[PDB]
Amino acid sequence: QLRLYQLYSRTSGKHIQVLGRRISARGEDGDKYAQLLVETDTFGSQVRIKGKETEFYLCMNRKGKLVGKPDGTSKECVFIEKVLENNYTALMSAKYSGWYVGFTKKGRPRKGPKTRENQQDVHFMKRYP
């Protein structure tokens, strides 16, 4: 299943942007770089996230850095989607368990190794523009 939406960062107050190679969470509602095509496998656990504008996939490299890439074949470009008890959604790397997609209050992306599930930095709400 394919779906289109935006991811609102609990800490940054803005939406995730796939600007190209660079990833950020400073998108106003409706920002063209914040429109995300999200692919969900038949199990419902794993997702690929693609910026609709740039066509770059959101991925996490070995250094734990979030980065956009044109090629989304890598397992670094897959995330496990968890709806938490607090009703936010988190995105854990499928390649690097225990590492999460996250951002600072200024929308700067965080390093996987330095994250964990209970951090607000890694919490998101889904949004249908």
What CATH number did the domain enclosing 6 receive?
A: 2.80.10.50
Experimental technique used to determine this entry: X-ray
Q: Please report the sign of the dihedral spanned by the C-alpha atoms of residue 29, residue 5, residue 119, residue 97.
A: negative
Decide: 51 and 33 in contact? Cβ < 8 Å.
yes
What HEC string does the chain produce?
Answer: CEEEEEEEECCCCCEEEECCCCEEEEECCCCHHHCEEEEECCCCCEEEEEECCCCCEEEECCCCCEEEECCCCCHHHCEEEEECCCCCEEEEECCCCCCECCECCCCCECCHHHCCCCCHHHCEEEECC
Domain total of the chain? 1
Residue type, 109: P
Decide: 39 and 50 in contact? Cβ < 8 Å.
yes
Greatest CA separation found in the chain? 35
Bridge-partner residues for 2, per DSSP? 39
Domain region containing 52: 1-129
Q: Exposed (0-12), middle (13-18) or buried (19+): which is 85, by Cβ within 10 Å?
A: exposed
Instruction: Name the resolution in angstroms.
Output: 2.7
